[PDB]
Structure formats: C-alpha cells, structure tokens
Amino acid sequence: PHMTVFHDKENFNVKHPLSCRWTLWFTKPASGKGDNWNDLLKKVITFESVEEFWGIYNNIAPVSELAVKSDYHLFKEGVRPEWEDPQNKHGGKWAYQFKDKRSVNIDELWLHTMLAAIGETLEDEEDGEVMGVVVNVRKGFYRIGVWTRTTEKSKEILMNIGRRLKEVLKLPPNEMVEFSGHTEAAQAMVV
Amino acid sequence: MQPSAALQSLRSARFLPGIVQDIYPPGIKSPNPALNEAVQKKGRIFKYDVQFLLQFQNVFTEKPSPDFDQQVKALIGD
Ligand SMILES: C[n+]1cn([C@@H]2O[C@H](COP(=O)(O)OP(=O)(O)OP(=O)(O)O)[C@@H](O)[C@H]2O)c2nc(N)[nH]c(=O)c21
C-alpha cells in the first residue's frame, strides 16, 4: 500500500509529518548600496514534512557559503526569530560559538541542529520551551543557538535542552554551551 | 514553471499517522521506537532520530516549489 520516497522517489504516496509546522528564515547582509540596513530578515518557506525539509535543505546555500553577517533561523510556525516576538520576549537561548576552521564541519553541525529540532529530540513532549534554532555567520566565528520561550518555567527542562544541544554538536567536555536571556531584564546556566 | 514528479508526489501524498515501524524497504531503518515509546500523544508528537532523518538527504533533492529559485532570488534580491 504505502510507497515511501524510499520505495520510489518519483511515485510515493505517504510522507512523514513533523510535530508542528516550521519556517526557515534568512538574514541577509546589509546592501553595499547603503540604503537597507533596517530590513534584512526574510521569511523563506514554511513546511510540515521531513521530505519537504530535505527539498529545502538540498536547494539552499549551506552555512559555509553564506556571507558574513548572514543568519539562518528555523522557528516553529507563528514565531518570528526576533526578541520582540511575544513568544521570545521573556525567553533566551543556549548557544555555542565555533571558530571558522575547516575541520569544523559547520554545515553538518547546523544540519544536525535543525534535524534535532524538527525531529523533536531537543526537548520532551511537554516541555514547551524550544521556539527555534539559529546559526549566525560572523567575522570571527559561527554561533549555533537554541531559542527558548522562558528563562524560568522549569530550570531542569532548560538544562536538559542545553545538554542535548551539546551532544548534537558533538562537543567535548571542556567546551561549554551557555544560556542567556534575550533582554537585560530576563537575564538579571552553562553545560 | 512545471513541478517535478517527486514534488507532485509530495503534494498528493498523505501524512503518516505518527511513527511507524514496518513500512520501509530493505536497508532503510525505521525511526527509533524507544524514543516514541515514552511519548503520550502519539498522533501529535513524532520523535525521529537524526540517523533516520539523514536517510532522506540524497533521496528527496527536488525543489519544494516550481519557482523556488526565482522566489529565493527576489526575496534576497538586493
Ligand atoms: C536576533 N537579532 C539580531 N539583531 C541585529 O543583528 C546584530 C547581530 O546580532 P547577534 O545577536 O548575532 O550579535 P553579534 O554576536 O554578532 O554581536 P553584536 O552585534 O556585537 O552585539 C545585532 O547587533 C543587531 O544589530 C536583532 N535586532 C532586533 N531588532 N531583534 C532581534 O531579535 C535581532
């Protein structure tokens, strides 16, 4: 009955749902003209299947091809990847900064981060904390983060998310993943 | 602009009802059943291990829309 994409990648009739819809966003670098530094965040696409995810991923630039000051964000549908969104305003992030060196397969790390997000292995079913994940391309470094809805609903639920991100990123024990609130207030937790 | 066979199939396919163990052909692993064993709402929350998800990487390579390239260029056109 069920032909998956693995039975016939041109004629299949079942697809793999995600536990919510997700939207990919991209931040472009400021234009070299100089007339657009305040409108750089772009909504790319919303999707709801594992197959759709891979159609997107296979047709967009890997992180390692992005210009400096660019970002990708993968957020649950309805949440904009900004601190002002009502679902991020009282939240924060777990983050790690990587050096820009070739033995760091940043594309693979980012990919695995997004797969952990959409495959629901960052948090447990009732945690209600993960809002999205983000990769930032900067001059000195790359940063990978997991944005969270609160900073205090449950500390244990947040620490477990940080430990999972550290596992997903394959970091050794000296390398610490750090939690910070988005606002100075919601900041005033490392693993 | 014309959709691909895979895209046409994706558009018309039906969502699986959750994690299923017994629908994959030889050499393809199912999602880890242990991760879903503890899940309470199995019709809404679907845990897929990264290894399972990676199996799709070289399998579904088609664009998610016919003009995806044009939509992307105009979105980040500058
Ligand atoms: C996620 N985000 C990023 N920016 C802008 O993007 C820049 C990079 O944001 P960043 O948080 O990655 O900072 P970076 O580590 O590069 O360090 P900093 O710039 O020196 O503090 C910030 O400086 C802001 O100018 C943002 N601006 C707004 N208004 N809301 C956001 O949520 C937001």
Comparing CB atoms, the residue among A11, A16, A18 nearest residue B9 is A11
**3-class DSSP state for residue B15?**
strand
Is beta strand A142-148 parallel, antiparallel or unpaired with respect to B14-15?
unpaired
Tell me if chain B has a CB within 8 Å of the CB of A40: no
Q: Residue for token digits 């639920």?
A: A157
C-alpha to C-alpha distance for A166 and A185, rounded to whole angstroms: 26
Tell me if chain A has a CB within 8 Å of the CB of B6: yes
Rounded to a whole number of angstroms, the distance between the first and last alpha carbons of chain B is: 24
**3-class DSSP state for residue B9?**
helix
Beta-carbon contacts of residue B76 (< 8 Å; ≥ 6 apart): A26, A28, A42
Q: Which residue among A37, A71, A135 is best mutated to probe the pocket of ligand 1, counting the most ligand atoms within 8 A of its Cβ?
A: A71
Tell me if chain A has a CB within 8 Å of the CB of B78: yes
Contact B49, B35 (CB under 8 A): yes
Probe site for chain B from A33, A44, A50, A53 (most B CB atoms < 10 A): A50
Q: Which protein residue's CA is at the shortest distance from atom 32 of ligand 1?
A: A82
Contact A141, A98 (CB under 8 A): yes
The number of folded domains in chain B is 1
Minimal Cα–Cα distance from B76 to chain A, Å?
Answer: 7
Tokens standing for A34? 């100089």
Tokens standing for A190? 């490392």
Tokens standing for A168? 């997903």
Strand partners, A71: A27, A136
Contacts of A5 in chain B (CB under 8 A): 6, 9, 56, 59-60
Q: Which protein residue's CA is at the shortest distance from atom 14 of ligand 1?
A: A138
Give me the sign of the Cα torsion angle B4, A61, A18, A84: negative
Comparing CB atoms, the residue among B50, B59, B60 nearest residue A119 is B50
**3-class DSSP state for residue B34?**
helix
A83 lines ligand 1 (CB under 6 A): yes
What DSSP string runs through A141-168? -EEEEEEES-SSS-HHHHHHHHHHHHHH
- Which phi and psi (to 5°) does residue A25 adopt? -125, 155
Domain that holds residue B74: 1-78
Residue A37 CA to its chain's centroid (Å)? 23
**What domains are there in chain A, each with its CATH number?**
1-191 (3.30.760.10)
Tokens standing for A22? 């997700």
DSSP state of B14: E
The burial class, CB within 10 Å (0-12 / 13-18 / 19+), for A14 is buried
- Which phi and psi (to 5°) does residue B24 adopt? -105, 150
The alpha carbon of A77 and the centre of ligand 1 are apart by a number of angstroms equal to: 21
Instruction: Judge: B46–A19 Cβ closer than 8 Å, yes or no.
Output: yes
Instruction: Judge: A51–B10 Cβ closer than 8 Å, yes or no.
Output: yes
The Cα-based distances of B36 to A2, A19, A124 in angstroms read 21, 12, 10
Is beta strand A71-76 parallel, antiparallel or unpaired with respect to A130-137?
antiparallel
The burial class, CB within 10 Å (0-12 / 13-18 / 19+), for A1 is exposed
C-alpha to C-alpha distance for A53 and A56, rounded to whole angstroms: 5
Burial string for A139-169 (b: 16+ CB within 10 Å, else e) reads: eeebbbbbbbbbbeeeeebbebbbebbbebb
Q: Residue for token digits 């069920």?
A: A2
What DSSP string runs through chain A? ----TTT-TTS--EE-EEEEEEEEEEEPPPPSSSS-SS--EEEEEEEEEHHHHHHHHTTS--GGGSPTT-EEEEEETT--SSTTSTTTTT-EEEEEEEP--TTS-HHHHHHHHHHHHHTT-SS-TTT--EEEEEEEE-SS-EEEEEEES-SSS-HHHHHHHHHHHHHHTT--TTSPPEEEESSSTTT--B-
